Amino acid sequence: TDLPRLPFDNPDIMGIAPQMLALQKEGPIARVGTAGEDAWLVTRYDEVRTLLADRRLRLSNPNPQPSAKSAARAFMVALMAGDDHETEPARHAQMRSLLIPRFSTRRLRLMKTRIEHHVDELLDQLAASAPPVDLHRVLSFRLPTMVVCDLLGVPLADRERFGQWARGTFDQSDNEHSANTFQQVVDYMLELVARKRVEPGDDILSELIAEKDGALSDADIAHLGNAVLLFGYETTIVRIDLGTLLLLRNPVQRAQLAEDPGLAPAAVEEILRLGVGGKGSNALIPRYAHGDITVGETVIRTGDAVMLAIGAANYDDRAFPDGGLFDLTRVRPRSHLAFGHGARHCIGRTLARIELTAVFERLFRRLPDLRLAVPEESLRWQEHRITGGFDEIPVTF
Ligand code: HEM
Ligand SMILES: CC1(C)C[C@H]2C[C@@H](C(=O)O)[C@@H]3COC(=O)[C@]4(CO4)[C@]23C1
């Protein structure tokens, strides 16, 4: 009898921690310790997918005196309209109503074309340079920040201003750094909303300003833009790094994709499903029970914290045969959980898929000999950031 304690050790730089796979083998749900409060950990695909669609399980904390959070997590939860359990239903509903139509088929079609040319240009610069090159700096970081510049209608050079702000806002190890960085994000976005009020374009804030004959306050609009800025590039950067690392580990699938870029959508779904870094703390979706819920033979009581392990569920042999294997030839694979599911299903997921598809359509066709210039074990996953990630990916080609 030994209460398991999150985060679990991972001897590899990717994948799921052995202890979490061991718990998954025993059953769908276990009581675990964490850095803060104890929580129920749900590790099997069927139960994680079910609980994500259960409206009794919500982001907001209903408890009368809530456990303390890092500044980073508090900012995250506020950007997701989960900071007040009494107003979360109306506020979260409004958030999704206002953001979903910003990712229209018209906008996505136009952005796919620009994304494709941009990747072409990024790879031509990469191919013209002398190895070793940091693939994270010159490819992974550059495409998703370009996309956010396009969404917000700002010059591309602005990403050199905001490109580290998600990392800094979400630094759980330094409350003061987190708050100072979020203040910069806020100041920037308020500047931007004031400009878009007199100089609109074909971009997200201009559409928010025009919404409901202009009924939204500057604070309301900047909130929504901050969510786009802070959720809209960093996680995608990390998936380009993880997808590259995964394809480097699987040369047969990599050669298949290089030969047939029509496999890129399938590859991207495998990358999302298998792409978990380090101790994988970002592959947990946190919730609180707002009513009692029975999971198998376990009773989750109102007020309990629940960690929905989307990473472990995406590796679950019960949902994906040979769940640990990268196989872009899977026939009708189940929908992975990397974007979540239910009420908070990732608003940007179609755009993120467009970005990743454009990259991996091209990468190994344009640079067939691309490979790591350093050992895998020297790559350092950044555990203190809510979004994790690697700081550099040195390559040769
Ligand atoms: C590969 C890249 C991405 C991954 C893996 C990812 C993953 C996720 C996940 C798992 C959630 C649900 C969190 C929860 O249920 O607590 C989420 C929510 C969200 N995502 Fe994404 N995301 C990605 C990219 C993006 C992009 C590109 C955008 C927009 C430009 C975006 C905007 C959002 C927003 C606004 C939410 C909040 C939805 C809500 O709370 O209702 N994300 N994302
Ligand atoms: C709004 C988010 C940025 C979306 C998810 C992406 C995930 C990641 O970075 O992989 C990040 C980590 O922390 C979480 O609570 C997650 C899992 O819900 C998120 C929060």
Side-chain angles (χ1 to χ4, degrees):
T1 307
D2 190 352
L3 176 77
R5 322 293 178 114
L6 289 177
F8 303 136
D9 283 344
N10 186 1
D12 196 9
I13 59 154
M14 288 182 296
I16 310 299
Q19 298 171 243
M20 195 177 291
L21 292 171
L23 293 169
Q24 190 191 61
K25 185 183 118 304
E26 302 284 28
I29 175 175
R31 192 74 177 167
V32 302
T34 80
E37 54 195 315
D38 284 34
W40 308 97
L41 178 68
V42 189
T43 53
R44 287 182 181 184
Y45 177 97
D46 277 347
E47 288 84 358
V48 172
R49 200 180 188 267
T50 296
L51 288 176
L52 280 165
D54 190 329
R55 270 60 190 172
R56 297 169 292 184
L57 217 53
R58 311 173 178 194
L59 182 70
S60 67
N61 193 336
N63 288 287
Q65 282 153 100
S67 172
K69 278 152 51 204
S70 67
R73 274 288 178 186
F75 290 134
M76 187 166 272
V77 168
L79 293 160
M80 288 156 88
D83 46 312
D84 185 337
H85 69 106
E86 300 197 31
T87 64
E88 177 191 39
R91 288 181 76 227
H92 183 241
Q94 178 189 288
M95 170 154 66
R96 292 194 61 98
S97 293
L98 291 168
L99 285 179
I100 278 162
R102 312 281 76 82
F103 297 82
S104 81
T105 60
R106 177 202 67 94
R107 161 154 301 126
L108 291 185
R109 278 191 307 257
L110 286 165
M111 291 185 83
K112 177 181 201 256
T113 303
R114 297 171 46 99
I115 287 164
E116 283 168 347
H117 295 299
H118 203 252
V119 172
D120 283 348
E121 301 185 34
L122 283 169
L123 292 177
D124 280 344
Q125 292 290 315
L126 177 45
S129 62
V133 168
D134 183 0
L135 178 140
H136 164 87
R137 181 56 52 211
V138 309
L139 172 64
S140 300
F141 166 82
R142 285 193 183 146
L143 173 80
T145 51
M146 181 279 287
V147 168
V148 168
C149 288
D150 201 25
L151 288 178
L152 299 169
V154 292
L156 182 53
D158 268 23
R159 68 97 188 280
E160 297 299 334
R161 188 165 162 204
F162 66 66
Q164 304 294 312
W165 283 351
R167 285 155 167 207
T169 299
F170 298 142
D171 184 339
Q172 306 168 101
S173 75
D174 189 347
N175 287 342
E176 195 184 81
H177 183 58
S178 174
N180 285 335
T181 308
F182 189 61
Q183 191 51 52
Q184 291 177 267
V185 170
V186 168
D187 293 341
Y188 174 80
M189 188 71 47
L190 287 174
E191 285 164 33
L192 187 46
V193 168
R195 181 160 87 248
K196 294 292 172 176
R197 285 210 179 275
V198 288
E199 195 196 350
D202 178 20
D203 53 68
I204 267 71
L205 302 181
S206 307
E207 298 166 358
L208 290 173
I209 290 169
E211 181 78 65
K212 310 180 190 324
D213 215 66
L216 298 172
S217 76
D218 281 24
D220 283 355
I221 297 170
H223 175 132
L224 294 176
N226 286 341
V228 169
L229 181 52
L230 291 175
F231 305 155
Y233 69 81
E234 189 60 33
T235 306
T236 308
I237 294 174
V238 174
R239 294 323 179 278
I240 297 174
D241 289 329
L242 289 175
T244 299
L245 291 179
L246 288 169
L247 286 164
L248 291 182
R249 296 199 159 175
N250 293 271
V252 175
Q253 318 270 295
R254 196 184 64 239
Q256 269 190 283
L257 176 62
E259 187 192 48
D260 180 15
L263 295 175
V268 166
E269 294 308 304
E270 274 300 86
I271 285 167
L272 291 162
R273 182 184 75 84
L274 288 172
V276 182
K279 296 186 191 181
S281 297
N282 58 319
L284 305 175
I285 292 185
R287 295 292 186 257
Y288 288 91
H290 285 235
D292 290 2
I293 307 161
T294 299
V295 173
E297 301 106 270
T298 294
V299 180
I300 301 175
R301 296 286 177 175
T302 303
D304 298 338
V306 177
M307 296 298 117
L308 299 170
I310 55 178
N314 280 343
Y315 278 67
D316 182 2
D317 283 333
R318 299 161 190 75
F320 302 95
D322 298 312
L325 295 190
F326 192 104
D327 180 3
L328 41 67
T329 80
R330 292 172 180 278
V331 180
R332 205 171 97 102
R334 280 174 170 93
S335 301
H336 61 71
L337 302 167
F339 293 119
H341 192 246
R344 296 185 169 268
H345 203 183
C346 165
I347 286 171
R349 61 185 184 277
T350 307
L351 181 56
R353 284 178 164 119
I354 285 161
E355 293 185 53
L356 292 175
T357 299
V359 167
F360 293 114
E361 260 172 358
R362 275 151 189 97
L363 179 56
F364 292 104
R365 156 164 296 245
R366 181 79 188 75
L367 307 166
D369 302 329
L370 174 87
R371 65 197 176 283
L372 288 182
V374 299
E376 268 191 336
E377 318 72 39
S378 67
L379 299 179
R380 308 166 299 264
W381 185 260
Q382 295 305 302
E383 298 291 346
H384 60 289
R385 307 193 302 225
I386 295 169
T387 46
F390 302 98
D391 277 350
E392 60 174 359
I393 301 283
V395 297
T396 187
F397 47 82

Coordinates of all heavy atoms in Angstrom, one line a residue, residues 59 80 92 95-96 99 103 151 227-228 231-232 235-236 239 272 285-287 310 338-340 343-348 351-352 355-356, ligand 1:
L59 N -14.3 22.5 -15.0 CA -13.0 23.1 -14.7 C -13.1 23.9 -13.4 O -12.1 23.8 -12.6 CB -12.6 24.1 -15.9 CG -11.2 24.7 -15.7 CD1 -10.1 23.7 -15.9 CD2 -11.0 25.9 -16.7
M80 N -10.0 30.7 -19.3 CA -11.0 29.7 -19.7 C -12.3 29.9 -19.0 O -13.2 29.0 -19.1 CB -10.5 28.3 -19.4 CG -9.4 27.8 -20.4 SD -8.4 26.4 -19.7 CE -9.5 25.1 -20.3
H92 N -18.7 30.7 -19.8 CA -18.0 29.7 -20.7 C -18.9 29.6 -21.9 O -18.3 29.5 -23.0 CB -17.8 28.3 -20.0 CG -17.1 27.4 -20.9 ND1 -17.7 26.2 -21.3 CD2 -15.9 27.4 -21.5 CE1 -16.8 25.6 -22.1 NE2 -15.8 26.3 -22.2
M95 N -18.1 32.5 -24.1 CA -16.8 32.3 -24.7 C -16.7 31.5 -25.9 O -16.1 31.9 -26.9 CB -15.8 31.7 -23.6 CG -14.5 31.3 -24.2 SD -13.3 31.3 -23.0 CE -13.8 30.0 -22.0
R96 N -17.4 30.3 -25.9 CA -17.3 29.4 -27.0 C -18.2 30.0 -28.1 O -17.9 29.8 -29.3 CB -17.8 28.0 -26.6 CG -16.7 27.4 -25.7 CD -16.9 25.9 -25.5 NE -16.8 25.2 -26.8 CZ -15.7 24.5 -27.2 NH1 -14.6 24.5 -26.5 NH2 -15.8 23.8 -28.3
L99 N -16.0 32.6 -29.9 CA -14.7 32.1 -30.5 C -14.9 31.2 -31.7 O -14.2 31.3 -32.7 CB -13.8 31.5 -29.4 CG -13.1 32.5 -28.4 CD1 -12.3 31.7 -27.4 CD2 -12.3 33.5 -29.2
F103 N -13.3 30.8 -36.4 CA -12.6 29.7 -37.1 C -13.4 29.2 -38.2 O -13.6 28.0 -38.3 CB -12.1 28.7 -36.1 CG -11.1 29.3 -35.1 CD1 -11.6 29.9 -33.9 CD2 -9.7 29.2 -35.3 CE1 -10.8 30.5 -33.0 CE2 -8.9 29.8 -34.3 CZ -9.4 30.4 -33.2
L151 N -4.1 35.5 -37.3 CA -5.4 35.6 -36.6 C -5.7 36.9 -36.0 O -6.9 37.4 -36.0 CB -5.5 34.5 -35.5 CG -5.5 33.1 -35.9 CD1 -5.5 32.2 -34.7 CD2 -6.8 32.9 -36.7
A227 N -6.8 34.6 -24.7 CA -7.0 33.2 -24.8 C -6.4 32.7 -26.1 O -5.8 31.6 -26.2 CB -8.4 32.8 -24.6
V228 N -6.7 33.4 -27.2 CA -6.2 33.0 -28.5 C -4.6 33.1 -28.5 O -3.9 32.2 -29.0 CB -6.8 33.9 -29.7 CG1 -6.0 33.7 -31.0 CG2 -8.2 33.6 -29.9
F231 N -3.2 30.3 -25.8 CA -3.5 29.0 -26.1 C -3.2 28.6 -27.6 O -3.1 27.4 -27.9 CB -5.0 28.6 -25.8 CG -5.4 28.9 -24.4 CD1 -6.7 29.1 -24.1 CD2 -4.5 28.9 -23.3 CE1 -7.1 29.4 -22.8 CE2 -4.9 29.2 -22.0 CZ -6.2 29.4 -21.7
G232 N -3.0 29.6 -28.4 CA -3.0 29.4 -29.8 C -1.7 29.2 -30.6 O -1.7 28.9 -31.8
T235 N 1.3 25.3 -27.6 CA 1.0 23.8 -27.7 C 1.2 23.3 -29.1 O 1.7 22.2 -29.2 CB -0.5 23.6 -27.3 OG1 -0.7 24.2 -26.0 CG2 -0.8 22.1 -27.2
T236 N 0.9 24.1 -30.2 CA 1.2 23.6 -31.5 C 2.8 23.5 -31.8 O 3.2 22.6 -32.4 CB 0.6 24.6 -32.5 OG1 -0.8 24.8 -32.2 CG2 0.7 24.0 -34.0
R239 N 3.9 20.3 -30.5 CA 3.5 19.1 -31.3 C 4.3 19.0 -32.6 O 4.6 17.8 -33.1 CB 2.0 19.2 -31.7 CG 1.0 19.1 -30.5 CD 1.6 18.1 -29.5 NE 0.7 17.9 -28.3 CZ 0.7 18.8 -27.2 NH1 1.5 19.8 -27.2 NH2 -0.1 18.5 -26.2
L272 N -0.5 13.4 -32.8 CA -1.3 13.9 -31.7 C -1.5 12.9 -30.6 O -1.5 13.1 -29.4 CB -2.6 14.5 -32.2 CG -2.5 15.7 -33.1 CD1 -3.7 16.0 -33.9 CD2 -2.1 17.0 -32.2
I285 N -6.0 16.6 -18.1 CA -7.1 17.6 -18.1 C -7.6 17.6 -16.7 O -8.2 16.6 -16.3 CB -8.1 17.3 -19.2 CG1 -7.6 17.5 -20.6 CG2 -9.3 18.3 -18.9 CD1 -8.6 17.4 -21.7
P286 N -7.5 18.7 -16.0 CA -8.0 18.8 -14.6 C -9.5 19.2 -14.5 O -10.0 20.1 -15.3 CB -7.1 19.8 -14.0 CG -6.9 20.8 -15.1 CD -6.9 20.0 -16.4
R287 N -10.2 18.6 -13.5 CA -11.6 18.9 -13.3 C -11.9 18.8 -11.8 O -11.1 18.3 -11.0 CB -12.5 17.9 -14.1 CG -12.4 18.0 -15.6 CD -13.0 19.3 -16.1 NE -13.1 19.3 -17.6 CZ -12.3 20.0 -18.3 NH1 -11.2 20.7 -17.8 NH2 -12.5 20.0 -19.7
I310 N -5.5 12.2 -20.6 CA -5.8 12.0 -22.1 C -4.6 11.4 -22.7 O -4.7 10.6 -23.7 CB -6.1 13.4 -22.7 CG1 -5.0 14.4 -22.5 CG2 -7.5 13.9 -22.3 CD1 -5.2 15.8 -23.1
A338 N -6.3 14.0 -27.7 CA -5.3 15.1 -27.5 C -5.9 16.5 -27.5 O -5.3 17.4 -27.0 CB -4.2 15.0 -28.6
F339 N -7.0 16.7 -28.2 CA -7.8 18.0 -28.2 C -8.8 18.0 -27.1 O -9.6 19.0 -27.1 CB -8.4 18.3 -29.5 CG -7.4 18.6 -30.6 CD1 -7.3 17.7 -31.7 CD2 -6.5 19.6 -30.5 CE1 -6.4 18.0 -32.8 CE2 -5.6 19.9 -31.6 CZ -5.5 19.0 -32.7
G340 N -8.9 17.0 -26.3 CA -10.0 17.0 -25.3 C -11.3 16.4 -26.0 O -11.3 15.8 -27.0
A343 N -17.5 19.6 -23.5 CA -17.8 21.0 -23.4 C -16.7 21.9 -23.7 O -16.9 23.0 -24.3 CB -18.3 21.4 -22.0
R344 N -15.4 21.5 -23.5 CA -14.3 22.4 -23.7 C -13.4 21.9 -24.8 O -12.2 22.3 -24.9 CB -13.5 22.5 -22.4 CG -14.3 23.3 -21.3 CD -13.5 23.5 -20.0 NE -14.2 24.4 -19.1 CZ -14.0 25.8 -19.1 NH1 -13.2 26.3 -20.0 NH2 -14.7 26.5 -18.2
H345 N -13.9 21.0 -25.7 CA -13.2 20.5 -26.9 C -12.5 21.7 -27.6 O -13.1 22.7 -27.9 CB -14.2 19.8 -27.8 CG -13.6 18.8 -28.7 ND1 -14.3 18.2 -29.7 CD2 -12.3 18.4 -28.9 CE1 -13.5 17.4 -30.4 NE2 -12.3 17.5 -29.9
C346 N -11.2 21.5 -27.8 CA -10.3 22.5 -28.3 C -10.9 23.3 -29.5 O -11.2 22.7 -30.5 CB -9.0 21.9 -28.7 SG -7.9 23.0 -29.7
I347 N -11.0 24.6 -29.3 CA -11.6 25.5 -30.3 C -10.7 25.6 -31.6 O -11.2 25.7 -32.7 CB -12.0 26.9 -29.8 CG1 -13.2 26.8 -28.9 CG2 -12.2 27.9 -30.9 CD1 -13.5 28.0 -28.1
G348 N -9.4 25.5 -31.4 CA -8.5 25.6 -32.5 C -8.1 24.4 -33.3 O -7.2 24.4 -34.1
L351 N -7.6 24.3 -37.1 CA -6.5 25.0 -37.5 C -5.2 24.3 -37.1 O -4.2 24.3 -37.9 CB -6.6 26.4 -36.8 CG -5.5 27.4 -37.1 CD1 -5.3 27.6 -38.7 CD2 -5.7 28.8 -36.4
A352 N -5.1 23.8 -35.9 CA -3.9 23.1 -35.5 C -3.6 21.9 -36.4 O -2.4 21.7 -36.8 CB -4.0 22.6 -34.1
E355 N -2.1 23.2 -39.7 CA -0.7 23.6 -39.5 C 0.2 22.3 -39.5 O 1.2 22.3 -40.2 CB -0.4 24.3 -38.2 CG -1.1 25.7 -38.2 CD -0.7 26.4 -36.9 OE1 0.5 26.5 -36.6 OE2 -1.6 26.9 -36.2
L356 N -0.1 21.4 -38.7 CA 0.7 20.1 -38.6 C 0.7 19.4 -39.9 O 1.7 18.8 -40.3 CB 0.1 19.3 -37.5 CG 0.3 19.7 -36.0 CD1 -0.4 18.8 -35.0 CD2 1.8 19.9 -35.6
Ligands
HEM1 C1 -1.8 20.8 -31.5 C2 -2.2 21.9 -30.9 C3 -3.2 22.0 -29.8 C4 -3.6 21.0 -28.8 C5 -2.9 19.6 -28.7 C6 -4.6 21.6 -28.0 C7 -5.3 21.0 -26.9 C8 -6.4 21.5 -26.2 C9 -7.1 20.8 -25.2 C10 -6.7 19.4 -24.7 C11 -8.1 21.6 -24.7 C12 -9.1 21.3 -23.6 C13 -8.7 21.7 -22.2 C14 -9.7 21.3 -21.2 O1 -10.7 20.6 -21.5 O2 -9.5 21.6 -20.0 C15 -8.0 22.9 -25.5 C16 -8.8 24.0 -25.3 C17 -8.7 25.1 -26.0 N1 -7.9 25.4 -27.1 FE1 -6.5 24.0 -27.9 N2 -4.9 22.9 -28.5 C18 -4.1 23.1 -29.6 C19 -4.1 24.2 -30.3 C20 -4.9 25.3 -30.2 C21 -5.0 26.4 -31.2 C22 -4.1 26.5 -32.5 C23 -6.0 27.2 -30.7 C24 -6.4 28.6 -31.3 C25 -5.7 29.3 -32.2 C26 -6.5 26.7 -29.5 C27 -7.5 27.3 -28.7 C28 -8.1 26.7 -27.6 C29 -9.1 27.3 -26.7 C30 -9.6 28.7 -26.8 C31 -9.4 26.4 -25.7 C32 -10.4 26.5 -24.6 C33 -11.7 25.8 -24.9 C34 -12.7 25.8 -23.7 O3 -12.2 25.9 -22.6 O4 -13.9 25.8 -24.0 N3 -5.8 25.5 -29.2 N4 -6.9 22.8 -26.4

